[PDB]
Amino acid sequence: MRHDGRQHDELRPITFDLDEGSVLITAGNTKVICNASVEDRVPPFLRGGGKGWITAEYSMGRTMEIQRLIGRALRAVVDLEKLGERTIWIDCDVIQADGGTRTASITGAFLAMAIAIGKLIKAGTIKTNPITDFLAAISVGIDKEQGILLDLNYEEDSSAEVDMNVIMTGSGRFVELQGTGEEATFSREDLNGLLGLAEKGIQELIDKQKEVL
Amino acid sequence: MRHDGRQHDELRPITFDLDEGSVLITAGNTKVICNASVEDRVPPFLRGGGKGWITAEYSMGRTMEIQRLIGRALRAVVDLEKLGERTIWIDCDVIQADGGTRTASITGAFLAMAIAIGKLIKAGTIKTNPITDFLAAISVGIDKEQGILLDLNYEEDSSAEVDMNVIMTGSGRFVELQGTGEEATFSREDLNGLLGLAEKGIQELIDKQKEVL
C-alpha cells in the first residue's frame, strides 16, 4: 500500500552499527552517527551538587529544539545522582535524511550513552548502573489516503496530515509526546491508534537495543 | 490543596475583554493582548492560488516556536480556500506572565481572528464563514505532590514533573498535543487523566468564547 512496499505497521530496516563507543543507526535511508563522551565537570548551577547532567550537540534554530529534546529524553531514564557530578555529552550528526531523523537520533543517542556508562561502571568510576530503563523513539502519522502509518520516510512525513513523535521507556511509560495536525485534526480514536502503532515500533527498537547491548 | 486555593480540576478566573477588534484575555494573573489584522496579500508560494494564510507575531528563539504553533493551530480550524487569497496577521503581546501564556495566547488569538473574520463577512468581502470550528488550548501537568493539575500557574508549571499543552476544537478533536516528562515519566493512565482534565478546561474556554462572540 505504501510506496515503500511496507505494511502500515512495519518499521523500515533498523541497523545499530558499532563499527570510540560511536553508534551508527540506520532506519531505511535515514542514517545518524551518535557519540557519547564523559567529562568530570557539570554546569555551574550544579557544581558541588554531587548530581550529574546530560546534554547533546546535534547537527545535520530548530536545531536547538532537537538538542534540548535529546538531553531531556535521556535525563528521564538516568538517575543523575548515581552518575556522580559529571556530564555526559551526546553528539549526533545526521549523515543521511529520509524521514524520522529526530527520533532516530534519540534511539542512537541512547545506545551511545549506554556504551559510555558501561565503561564508567567497568572502570570502577561509578558503583552502580544509573540507567533506570531502556528508551527509544519513533514517529507515527496519518496520511490522507493510507491511514495511520508507522515510521514515516521523508515523502510520507511531507504529505501526512498528522505528524507525531513519541518517546517511551522499555517499561512502556511516556517520556515525551508530540503530535501536530497540519490543516487537519485527529480524534481521540486516532490518537489511540497512533499511540498503539508507536508503542509497537518502540518495543521493537528496544528489543534490538537489548540484543546489541 | 493547591497554593492557589483552587481544586485540581478548576480553571483560574477567565476574562475575555474586548475593551480595533483587539482582545485581552486574562487567566488568573496571566494576561495577553491579541490582535488580528487582515491583508489582501499572501506569501509568494501562494500568490495566484486563491487560498489564504494565517500567520502570527508573538512577543513577551523559543519565540519563533510559539509563533509557529499559533499559526498552525488557527490554520487547522479555518478553510483557507473560503478565506480567499489574503492573510490574517495575529499579534500577541504577553503583558503579564504567571503560567499558561502560550495556551492563553492561542485562545485569545482565536477570538481576535473570529472578530476580524466576522467583519470580513459583514463587509461582504467573503461569502461564507471560513471558521470550521471553535478552538481553545490549555496546559495540564503532574505535580509530585498534588497529582494531576489543570491550568498551571508559574509556580506550579515550574515544579511539575510532567508538563503538557493541549489544543482541541469545539467538536472535541485534537489540533496539537505536547507533553514532556522532566526527569520523570508518565504512564498511559496518566496520559488519559491528563487529556480528560485538559478537555474539561478546553470545553469551558470554548463555552466562554461562544458566549462572548
CA–CA distance, B51 with B124 (Å, rounded to integer): 17
CA angle, residues A156, A157, A162, in degrees to nearest 5 = 110
CA–CA distance, B155 with A51 (Å, rounded to integer): 24
3-state secondary structure of B125: coil
3-state SS track over chain A:
CCCCCCCCCCCCCEEEECCCCCEEEEECCEEEEEEEEEECCCCHHHCCCCCCEEEEEEECCHHHHHHHHHHHHHHHCECHHHHCCCEEEEEEEEEECCCCHHHHHHHHHHHHHHHHHHHHHHCCCCCCCCECCCEEEEEEEEECCCEEEECCCHHHHHHEEEEEEEEEECCCCEEEEEEEECCCCECHHHHHHHHHHHHHHHHHHHHHHHHHC
Q: Residue B46 maps to which CATH number?
A: 3.30.230.70
Measured between beta carbons, which residues in chain B are less than 8 angstroms from residue A186?
A: 173-174
Which single residue is written with the C-alpha cell 468581502? Answer: B125
In a domain, B90, yes or no: yes
3-state secondary structure of B10: coil
* Backbone phi, psi, residue B67, to 5°: -60, -40
- Cβ-Cβ pairs closer than 8 A, A with B, add up to 82
DSSP state of B194: H
3-state secondary structure of B108: helix
Which single residue is written with the C-alpha cell 546534554? Answer: A55
In a domain, A181, yes or no: yes
Please report how many Cα atoms fall inside a 13 Å half-sphere around the Cα of residue A68, on the Cβ side: 10
Sequence letter at residue A64? M
CA–CA distance, B213 with B208 (Å, rounded to integer): 8
Which single residue is written with the C-alpha cell 493547591? Answer: B2
Which conformational region is residue B101 in: left (phi greater than 0), alpha (psi within -120 to 50 degrees), or beta? alpha
Was A50 annotated as part of a binding site? no
3-state secondary structure of B154: helix
Give me B112's grid cell.
Answer: 481576535
Nearest to A9 by CA among A201, A145, A163: A201
Tally of domains in chain A: 1
CA–CA distance, A181 with B115 (Å, rounded to integer): 24
CA angle, residues B126, B127, B130, in degrees to nearest 5 = 75
Whole-angstrom Cα Rg for chain B: 17
3-state secondary structure of B182: coil
How far out from the chain centre does Cα A180 lie?
A: 18
Experimental determination technique:
X-ray
Nearest to B28 by CA among B79, B97, B86, B74: B97
In a domain, A3, yes or no: no
Element of type H or E holding B208? helix B188-212
Measured between beta carbons, which residues in chain B are less than 8 angstroms from residue A181?
A: 76, 174-176
In a domain, B66, yes or no: yes
Chain B nearest-CA distance from A122, in A, is: 25
Find out whether A206 and A170 touch, Cβ atoms under 8 Å: yes
CA–CA distance, A60 with A66 (Å, rounded to integer): 11
User: Please, which residues bridge with residue A137 across strands?
Assistant: A167
CA–CA distance, B88 with B43 (Å, rounded to integer): 11
Was A15 annotated as part of a binding site? no
- Which residue in chain B is spatially nearest to A167 when comparing CA positions? B180
Q: Which residues of A46-57 are buried (b: 16+ CB within 10 A; e: fewer)?
A: eeeeebbbbbbe
Measured between beta carbons, which residues in chain A are less than 8 angstroms from residue B75?
A: 182-183
Expressed in angstroms, the distance from the first to the final Cα of chain A is 34
* Backbone phi, psi, residue B12, to 5°: -70, 165
Which single residue is written with the C-alpha cell 570510540? Answer: A20
Give me B41's grid cell.
Answer: 496579500
In a domain, A152, yes or no: yes
In a domain, B2, yes or no: no
Q: What is the largest CA-CA distance in chain A?
A: 57
Give me B42's grid cell.
Answer: 499572501
Residues of A with CB under 8 A from a CB of B: 61, 64-65, 72, 75-77, 80, 164, 169, 172-188, 190-191, 195
Helix A188-212 to helix A101-122 angle (10° resolution) is 40
* Backbone phi, psi, residue A212, to 5°: -80, -35
3-state secondary structure of B29: coil
Burial environment of residue B84 by CB neighbours within 10 A (0 to 12, 13 to 18, 19 or more): middle
Which conformational region is residue A48 in: left (phi greater than 0), alpha (psi within -120 to 50 degrees), or beta? left
What's the domain range around A155? 13-213
In a domain, B100, yes or no: yes
CA–CA distance, B41 with B61 (Å, rounded to integer): 27
- Which residue in chain A is spatially nearest to B181 when comparing CA positions? A175
User: What is the number of H-type helices and E-type strands within chain B?
Assistant: 5, 9
Per DSSP bridges, beta strands B30-39 and B53-59 are unpaired
In a domain, B8, yes or no: no
For the beta sheet containing B174-181, the strands, ordered from the edge strand earlier in sequence to the opposite edge, are A147-150, A135-143, A160-169, A174-181, B174-181, B160-169, B135-143, B147-150
